[PDB]
Design a protein around this ligand. Structure first.
Ligand SMILES: Nc1nc2c(ncn2[C@@H]2O[C@@H]3COP(=O)(O)O[C@H]4[C@@H](O)[C@H](n5cnc6c(=O)[nH]c(N)nc65)O[C@@H]4COP(=O)(O)O[C@H]3[C@H]2O)c(=O)[nH]1
Ligand SMILES: [Ca+2]
Ligand SMILES: [Ca+2]
Lengths: 95, 262
């Protein structure tokens, strides 16, 4: 599988994908592939109001067989807190 | 169109559904356990696994990292840990009835040390399933024993009298971590990943590990390493006299106890 990718077209797609109650934040990513809880994964995430691809080295905390996929918890480093901050600020309605 | 003010008001309600889902899992089989083999590095191996909690809802599987922040906020962690210990003992009964001498290592937090339900659950469940207490191993983080010492000491006496083993995880990162042990004598120590992760490359870590095992062995305390992911780590642990290893080099976590102990 290698590089997971998720582009969210709009704020409704973000609101629906985002896991606000996970420590450090998380996000649901579609993928047909088989992961185990606790796997380290690399994800490139694109958010509604920009073209910038944001790198996330996250951990699998959820598996589902709507879509097949995984819930990915953001890491606690500056890269994880950065992506959380950007998502939460977006979903607050902000510039 | 996304309405941010509406989303802000719906949050409180999203949290309430989660809490109810957790409370409902305290009753039945909505929680479950997966198992990670823990292998003896030095001689004939006990059939030992560590339990990991999951929550399952309609085929979806969740790590405690998905829900533990909610559980903490609603003071459900002690109930959840009681649930795991009860379930684990039930599993030991199931294994025993099929002819297996299985042991299980389970996590409990420091608020379980003064939980009268915990001690009762262990006694009552071991008797319901006819499981010898020696089959149940209970681990808590070193840092948390330090900050709850007197209740930890009382728990340790009560549970040790049932033949269960009580040990520490995330052990050894600290100046003389062996100094807690003057006040709390564990059956086993599981080394902090901060010490063991770079063991193949850092002599700083290699010294700390030999420091720990030279003090553990003469006291008859077992030592253990986790997140063991490569062979050079196995080699270093073996030479340092570490008793047990677990991690992806040995075996993944999974639903079944099908590991052939070697
Ligand atoms: N400990 C350990 N884990 C390994 C190892 N090899 C691979 N892993 C995986 O790596 C993750 C490490 O989490 P942790 O530090 O144990 O952190 C754990 C722990 O904080 C909590 N947790 C997991 N199981 C239990 C439990 O039975 N009781 C309690 N109270 N907490 C649990 O959930 C976190 C995530 O657990 P998982 O999603 O299962 O994901 C786990 C686990 O599946 C290993 O040698 N040792
Ligand atoms: Ca809010
Ligand atoms: Ca409670």
């Amino acid at each position: 599988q290698g590089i997971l990718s998720l582009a969210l077209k709009d704020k409704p797609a973000l609101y629906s994908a985002y896991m606000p109650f996970v420590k450090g934040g998380g996000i649901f990513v579609p993928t047909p592939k088989r992961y185990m809880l606790g796997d380290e994964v690399f994800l490139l995430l694109t958010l509604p109001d920009s073209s910038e691809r944001l790198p996330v080295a996250g951990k699998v905390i959820w598996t589902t067989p709507r879509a097949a996929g995984i819930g990915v918890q953001f890491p606690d480093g500056p890269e994880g807190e950065a992506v959380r901050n950007k998502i939460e600020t977006l979903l607050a309605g902000l510039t | 169109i996304y309405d941010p003010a509406a989303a802000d008001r719906a949050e409180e309600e999203r949290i309430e559904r989660w809490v109810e889902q957790l409370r409902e899992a305290l009753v039945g089989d909505g929680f479950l356990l997966h198992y990670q083999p823990v292998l003896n590095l030095q001689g004939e191996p006990l059939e030992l696994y560590q339990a990991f909690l999951r929550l399952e809802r309609n085929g979806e599987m969740m790590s405690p990292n998905a829900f533990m922040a909610i559980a903490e906020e609603h003071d459900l962690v002690t109930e959840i840990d009681r649930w795991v210990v009860a379930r684990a003992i039930r599993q030991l009964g199931e294994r025993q009835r099929a002819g297996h001498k299985t042991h299980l290592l389970v996590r409990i937090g420091p608020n379980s040390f003064s939980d009268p339900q915990m001690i009762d659950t262990i006694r009552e469940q071991l008797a319901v399933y006819g499981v010898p207490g020696e089959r149940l191993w209970l681990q808590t983080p070193e840092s948390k024993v330090f900050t709850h010492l007197r209740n930890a000491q009382q728990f340790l006496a009560a549970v040790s009298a049932m033949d269960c083993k009580v040990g520490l995880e995330q052990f050894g990162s600290g100046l003389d971590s062996f100094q807690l042990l003057a006040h709390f004598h564990p059956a086993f120590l599981k080394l902090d990943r901060g010490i063991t992760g770079d063991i193949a490359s850092a002599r700083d870590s290699q010294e700390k590990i030999r420091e720990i095992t030279s003090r553990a062995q003469p006291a008859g305390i077992l030592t253990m390493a986790e997140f063991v992911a490569d062979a050079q780590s196995m080699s270093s642990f073996f030479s340092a006299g570490v008793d047990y290893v677990q991690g992806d080099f040995v075996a993944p976590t999974g639903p079944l106890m099908n590991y052939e102990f070697g």
